């Protein structure tokens, strides 16, 4: 009688440097975002977090917001530079924050899901080497068991780390995201010591024993095809998938990196970080995984160099990142999952949700037709993945609200509501509305 139940959980996210503002307030220093924000070049026509949607500041409205739309769950994230400004020195103000923000949402009947890192690793941390040091094991779990002892009244579901691969590949190799090295052998180093530190906080979140408390990770991932039948294109796709997807399923689910990468990525780089201890503590049992899916990619062997696949463009409608739309590839994501790493656990879309040139009208709406009919077709993908007997607990949009979207500014717009910077006046899309309806009918 209902297409989703009662228990699923209807949710949006979104994430502390993304929306909070309020940089240099009430003890909180710069994460290596704000410093990569103000380097010249990195970030679309030098934009930064300063003030972002000022959800610091206004979260009583914007939790109000979700009430008044009938959100189930919130995914936020916690910043690390407001909870632990310098290395070793708590800053109750800033766990003062997150304390009221959950009070909030509980009192208005939002399930909260934290995100213990979304990215703004704090600058000290990188001044003595970041994610390239293995001691930031330990600082991440000094870091993780404060917030578990001190919130583990107001939040019972927990996610370690956002997307992995970002703050590996696309931070340290690729160079696009902070702190914007170009590295291959950095990248790989990085990839392991987040594996690690998330399992460090796995380690002391069992310890615990919390009642009635869940962990997880968010992994970004995606479909790889072939572009035609060709054993080069098959190679292609095979090197595609296991840089986005298989690096970081492996280890995690099974205990062992692709061997496949580690024989191609080590004709480039070193990949002596891998040993047996390791991904022991990598591979230790979660309660749930959040998925972050947007697109697929069609690929077409390149020139044999390093991670080289042609993008091929096959023709269909895209959003404004220039990503294709192809909501099938969430069902057959998921169904992978079911089917080769994670069986029975539960799952969740911890994102899904794009970007398009919204514009206020003279009416005062926006009328954001293409995100109503993208999340209509994702939502039915949904549904039919939990009809076929998948495990889905729920599903978060991305995002609440147009916010800082990292190297491009504040140029893409993924919010259901529209933010207009200059007022931070919220403005409910048409998609917004859309999104009340399926909370309110559970129907699609
Ligand atoms: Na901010
Ligand atoms: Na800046
Ligand atoms: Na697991
Ligand atoms: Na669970
Ligand atoms: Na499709």
New binding site residues.
């Given amino acids: 009688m209902l297409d989703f139940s009662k228990d699923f959980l209807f949710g949006v996210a979104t994430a502390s440097y993304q929306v909070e503002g309020a940089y240099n307030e009430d003890g909180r220093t710069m994460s290596i975002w704000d410093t990569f924000s103000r380097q010249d070049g990195k970030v679309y026509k030098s934009h930064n977090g300063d003030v972002a949607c000022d959800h610091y500041h206004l979260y009583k409205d914007d939790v109000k917001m979700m009430k008044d739309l009938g959100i189930e769950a919130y995914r936020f994230s916690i910043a690390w530079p407001r909870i632990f400004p310098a290395k070793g020195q708590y800053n109750p103000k800033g766990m003062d924050f997150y304390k009221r923000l959950t009070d909030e949402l509980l009192k208005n009947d939002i399930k909260p899901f934290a995100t213990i890192y979304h990215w703004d690793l704090p600058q000290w941390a990188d001044d003595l080497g970041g994610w390239l040091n293995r001691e930031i094991v330990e600082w991440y779990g000094e870091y993780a068991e404060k917030l578990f002892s001190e919130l583990g009244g107001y939040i019972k579901n927990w996610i370690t780390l956002n997307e992995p691969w970002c703050s590996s590949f696309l931070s340290y190799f690729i160079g696009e995201h902070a702190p914007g090295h170009k590295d291959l052998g950095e990248a790989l180093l990085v990839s392991h010591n987040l594996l690690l530190s998330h399992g460090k906080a796995v380690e002391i979140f069992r310890g615990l024993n919390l009642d009635d408390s869940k962990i997880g990770i968010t992994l970004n991932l995606n479909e790889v095809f072939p572009a035609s039948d060709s054993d080069d294109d098959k190679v292609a796709a095979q090197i595609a998938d296991g840089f986005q997807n298989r690096w970081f399923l492996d280890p995690l689910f099974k205990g062992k990196y692709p061997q496949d990468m580690v024989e191609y990525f080590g004709k480039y780089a070193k990949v002596d970080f891998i040993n047996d201890e390791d991904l022991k503590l990598i591979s230790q049992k979660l309660d749930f995984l959040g998925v972050n899916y947007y697109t697929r990619a069609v690929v077409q062997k390149g020139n044999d160099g390093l991670l080289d696949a042609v993008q091929i463009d096959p023709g269909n409608e895209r959003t404004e990142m220039g990503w294709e739309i192809?909501?099938?590839?969430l069902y057959n994501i998921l169904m992978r999952l079911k089917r080769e790493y994670t069986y029975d656990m539960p799952l969740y879309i911890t994102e899904n949700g794009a970007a398009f040139n919204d514009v206020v009208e003279d009416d005062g709406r926006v009328h954001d037709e293409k995100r109503v009919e993208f999340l209509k077709q994702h939502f039915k993908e949904a549904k039919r993945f939990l009809n076929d007997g998948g495990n889905l607990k729920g599903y978060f949009v991305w995002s609440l609200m147009d916010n800082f979207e990292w190297a491009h500014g504040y140029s893409k717009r993924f919010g259901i509501v529209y933010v207009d910077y200059e007022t931070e006046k919220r403005i409910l899309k048409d998609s917004a509305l859309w999104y009340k309806d399926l909370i309110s009918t559970r129907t699609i």
């Fill in positions: 192809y909501p099938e590839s």
